[PDB]
Amino acid sequence: MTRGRVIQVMGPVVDVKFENGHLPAIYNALKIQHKARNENEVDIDLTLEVALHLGDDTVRTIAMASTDGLIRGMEVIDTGAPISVPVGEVTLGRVFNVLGEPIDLEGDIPADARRDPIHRPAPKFEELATEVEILETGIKVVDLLAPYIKGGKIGLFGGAGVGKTVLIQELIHNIAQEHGGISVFAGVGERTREGNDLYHEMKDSGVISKTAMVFGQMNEPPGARMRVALTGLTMAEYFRDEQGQDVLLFIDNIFRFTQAGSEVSALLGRMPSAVGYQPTLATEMGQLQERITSTAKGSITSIQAIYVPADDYTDPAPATTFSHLDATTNLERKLAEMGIYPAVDPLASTSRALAPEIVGEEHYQVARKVQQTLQRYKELQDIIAILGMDELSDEDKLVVHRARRIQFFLSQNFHVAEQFTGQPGSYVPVKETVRGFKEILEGKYDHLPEDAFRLVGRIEEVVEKAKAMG
Template sequence: MTTTIVEKLRKQIESFDSAPTPEGIGTVVSVGDGVAEIDGLPNALMAEMLEFDISSDASLADSIGDTDRVFGMVLNLEEHAVRVVVLGDTRRVKEGMTVRSSGRVLSVPVGEALIGRVVNTLGEPIDGKGPIKEEKMYPVERPAHPVIERAPVKQPLHTGLKAVDSMIPIGRGQRELIIGDRFTGKTTIAVDTILNQINEPEATRPICIYVAIGQKESKTARIVAKLKDAGAMDFTIVVDAPASDPAALQFLAPYAGVTMGEYFMEKGKDVLVIYDDLSKQSVAYREVSLLLRRPPGREAFPGDIFYLHSRLLERSAKLSKELGGGSITALPIIETQEGDVSAYIPTNVISITDGQIFLETDLFNKGVRPAINVGLSVSRVGSSAQTKAMKSVAGKMRIELAQYRELEAFAQFSGDLDEDTKKRLDKGARLVEVLKQPHSSPLGVEKQVAIIVAANEGFFKTVSVEQTAEVSVKLATFLENQYAETLAKIRASGEVSDETKASLVKAYEQFTNAHPEHFTV
C-alpha cells in the first residue's frame, strides 16, 4: 500500500511541468467590510472570479499549512480600480496582496455527483463526505431560455398538501411564491413538497434543490436530517449560505442553486428549486451594494433589486420537446412583516411569479395548518397543471370556501339562520378541517382525491367539526391499507371513473361501519 502511494507520488512529481503562463494580476489597495479595492487587473471582467494569492507574502512552509483558497468576485469596474467582494474570510486578505485573475466569470460545479450533498455557494462540500468530482463548471449568471425554447406548463408538481394541490395547483416549470409572516409554515410547505416527491415514480421524480439563504445553521441541519431520515436526500441537493457567511455568498446562493438545476433541466429532467428565502437575499444584496457605494433607492435597496429577482426566477422554465422537455419549478419564499404584502420586495416578487401561496398568522394561531388564505392565494397556471381526477373533484372547493368565509363573519352577528345558510356553514367548517394536514405528512394525489371525494359525497356530514381532521387522516390510512388497488387506479389513470367512485363509496361505508364512534352528529 505504502509502495503504491510512493510510486504514484513519484510519477506525479516526474511528470510535473509548471510551465507558467502570463496571468493577469492586481494588488490589493484597501480591504474592509468584505470589499477589496484592487489596483491593476486591466482586463477584469464583470462578475469575474479572482483568487487572492495568500502565499504572496508568506513563506513556503506557511503557505503549505494554509491551503484554503480565498476567492473574490468583481462587482465594480471603475476608472482607477476594481472593487471586489471577498467570497471568504476577509481577515486573510491584506493590503498589498497579489490578486490573480481567473479569466472566467464566477462558476460552480454541476453534475450528478452533487445529488445527496450539502454544499456552499461555491459548490464546495460542507457535509464532511469528501470532495465532489464535478463533471462541469457552469457560470452562476446565465441567460434565461428565450420564449421560443419553452413549452406550456401542463404537468403537475404535487406538493402533497390537499389545500395546495386542489385549489392552488403548481405545474412543472412554474414559479409559485410562498409568502407570509415569520413562523407561519413557509419552510414547512417547501420541505413537505420535497418529501412528497418520494411518492413520485422514480422516472418522473424531480431533482430537488433547497437553497438556504441567511438561515440559522441549526435550522438547515434539522431540514437536512429530516430529508435524510425520509430518504429524500437521495434526490436532493442542499446549497447552504448561512447567516454567518459573507453577504456576497448569501446573495449569490440562489444563482448557484438554479445553475445546478439547469444542468439537469437541459438533460431533460425536472427540477424543483426552493429559495428560502429571497427576503434575506435582498438584504444581503443591499448590504453588498451599499458597501460598493452604489446609490441607494427606495428603502436603501439598489436600483437593480427587481432585476436581482427577475433574472433569477426567469431561469425557471419548461423547455420544449426539442430541448428535452426538462423543467425547473421554483418555490421562492418571501417573509412579510405584519402581513404587509404591499411592501417593496413582496410586490416585486409577486409581480414576477406565476402565483402565490399566502400564509396568515391568524389562521396559524387558530390551528388552521397549513395556514393558507385561499382567497388571497392563486396559481396563474391553474387547472392546466392538475390531473383530471383532481380537476373533477376540486372544482367547486374554492367557491364553497369563499362563501363559507363570508357567511362565517355574518353568522357571528346573526341569531336565527335559515337552513340553507346553516348547511353551507356546516359544510364549509368541515371543508376547512378536511384541508388541515399535519406537517411532514404529504399525501399522494390519489389519496387527496379520495378524501375530497369523501367530503363532496357528504361523508363528513355526521362527523363533528372537531373530529373531522382526525377522521380524514384515519380514512387516508384505511384507504391505503384496504383499498390500495383503487388508489393505484386513480394514480395510473389520473381520473375518477364511475367504477372507481363506486369503489370509494363502498370504502366510505365500510369505514363508517368500522368506526361508528366518529359518526355521532
Template sequence: PLSRQIISKPLALGVRVLDSMLTCGEGQRMGIFAAAGGGKSTLMAMLVKSANVDVTVMALIGERGREVREFIENDLGPEGMKKSVLICATSDKSSMERAKAAYVATSIAEYFRDQGKKVLFLMDSVTRFGRAQREIGLSAGEPPTRRGYPPSVFANLPRLMERVGMNDKGSITALYTVLVEGDDMNEPIADETRSILDGHIILSRKMAQAYRYPAVDVLASASRVMNSITTKEHQAKAGRVRELLAKYEEVELLVRIGEYQNGADLVADEALEKYEPIVTFLKQRTDEHADFDETIAQLQNLV
C-alpha cells in the same frame, strides 16, 4: 420568451390543499408568503417528500445554521436525499455569498431541466436574498429607495425568477418563500415578488397557532394558471368550497354570539354544516402523501 412552453398540465405536489384549491402547473412559479412562525418550513418539508418530480433543488438562503442538518436528516431523510440537491448559505455568511447561492441553485436546476428532468426548485427565502442584494447595493453607493432597498434589488428579482419554467427539454416548477415583515403584504419584497410570480400561497399564523397544517389561507391565495390546467368540474367544486369558506367567515361571529338563526340564509346553513368536513379535508399530517386523483375525487364528494 417564445421558446418557453405553455403550462398545460398540473403537477401533483402531494399536498391536498394545494392540489385541490391552488393547483400548480408543471413549470409554474409560485410564492409562499408568511410571517415568522407561519409554517413555511413545515409546508416545504411536505413538498420535498410528496411532490411528483424527478429532482428537487433546494436553496436555503440566509437561514439559521441549525436548520440545515435538521432539514437533511429529519425532513429529507435517505430517500429524499437520493433525488435532492441542497445549496446553503446561512445567515452568518457574507452578503455576496448569500446572493450568489441563489444564482448557483438556479443554475443547478437549469442543468437538470436541460437533461429532460422534471425539477422542483424551492428557495427559502427571497426576503433574505433581497436583504443580501440591499447590502451589496448600498455598499456600492446606490441610493436607498423603497424602505431602504436600492434599485438593483428590484432589477435582480425578475432576472433570477424568469430563469425557471419550461423549455422544450424539461421543466422547473419553482416555489419561493417570502418572509412578510410585520404581516404587511405590501412591503417591497413581497409586493414585487407577487407581481412577478404566477401565483401566491398565503400562510396564516392564526391557523399555524391552532395547529392546522398546512396553514394555507385558501381565500387569500391564488394560482394564476389553475383554470388552464384543471377541468371545469374541478374548478366549480373548488369555487364552491371557497364560497362556503367565505360565507362561514361572514357569519362566524353571529353564530358565536347566538345571533344567527338557522334558515335565514341557505348558503350560510350549508357553510356551517360543511365547515368541519372542509377543514378536515384541507388538513394534512407532515408525513402524509396525498394522491392527486384521490384528492380530486374527495373534493368532488365534499360539496
C-alpha cells in the same frame, strides 16, 4: 503574466491591479492563496468576484469571505471564468456553500467532475414552452384551491410553528415519487441552527438522498449571501437541461437576497433608489427569476418564502417580487391549532391557474362552491359564539354542517409524518379530490361523523374510517 496584485482594501471591497491588456472580465472569480512567510503574516484563502473596471488597469471586486489579514501587494490569480460549482448526481445528498465546496464531513468532490458557470443568460424565446401545464403535487388543498404551474413561481407566506418545513419535505417526497424529479434547497440568509435542524430533519425523513442543499449563512459577506441563490439555480438547471426532469427549487427567503443586493450596491457606492434599495433591484430580480422557466424538455418550479417589511405590501421589494409570482400559499396558525396539519388557508390562498381555460370547468365550479361555503361558514362565527348553535336557521345549520366536513376533508396524512404517527401517507390525484369534494358538496355523506374526515386520503378512506369507528 496572468497575475494580479492587491492594491487597496476597504472592508469587504478589494481592488486589484492587473497587467495592461490582461484584465479579467466582469463576474470572473479571483483566488488568493497565501502562505505565511514569517511570524508577522497569516494564511489567506479568499475568493473575489469582479464587479467594475475602474480604469488604469484596476478592477474592483467583492469578497466572498473575511478580508482580515490581507496585505497590499500579494499575488492574485485569475481563474478565467465565473464561479463554477459541481453538477450531476454527486450533488445529491450533499450540502454546499456558495463557492460549491461541500460543507458536511463526507469528503470533497474530485476535480475531475464537471462544473458549470454561475452566471449565464436566460433561455431564449424559441426554447420556451407554448402551453401551460399543471404540476400535480398530490396534496388535496393545493391541487384544488391553488394549483401549481410547471415553470411557475409560488410565494409561501407564514412563520414558525405552521409546518413550513414539513410541507416542503412532503412536496419533495411527492414530486420525486410520482414524477421522478429531484429538488434543490437554497438557504439564502440561513440561520446556522435552523440549517442544521433542517438537515437533520431531512436525514430523518429520508428525502435527503434526492435533494441538493446549498447554504449561504447569515454570517457570510453580502456577496456570498447574494450569490448563493444563483448556485442553487445552476444546480437545478443542470438537471432541467440535461436529464429532462421536472425539478423543484426552494429558496429560504428571497427578501434576504434583495437586501444582500442592496448592501452590495451600498458598499460599491451607487446612488440609492426607491426608499433605500439598489438602482438595479428590478434588473437583479428579473435576472434571477427568468431562469426558472419551463422549456421544451423540462421545467423548474420554484417556491419562495417571502418576508414583507413593515407589513407593507407596496414596499418596493415585495412589489418587485409579486410581479413574477403565479400562485400563493398561506399557512394559518388557527388551522394549525385546530388540527389541520396541512395548515393551508383555503380562502387566503390564491392562484393564477384557477381559471376554467386550463383547469377544467368542473374543477373551477367545485373550487368556487367550496370557497363560497367556507366563506359562508366564516361569516357565522360571531353569531354562533354569541347566541349558540341552536339559534340559527335551517339553511345556516346545513351550511355549518357541510362546512365542518369540508374543513376536515381539506386535511391529509403525509408520508413524512409516518415516523411520528404510524399511519402511512397518501397521494391523492386531482380527479379524486375533485370528485370527493363534489360528493361532499352534494350531501352524499351528511350522515357520516365529522371526525371520519380528519386525516384520510381519497373519499373511500373516510367511509372505511367511519365504519371502523362504528
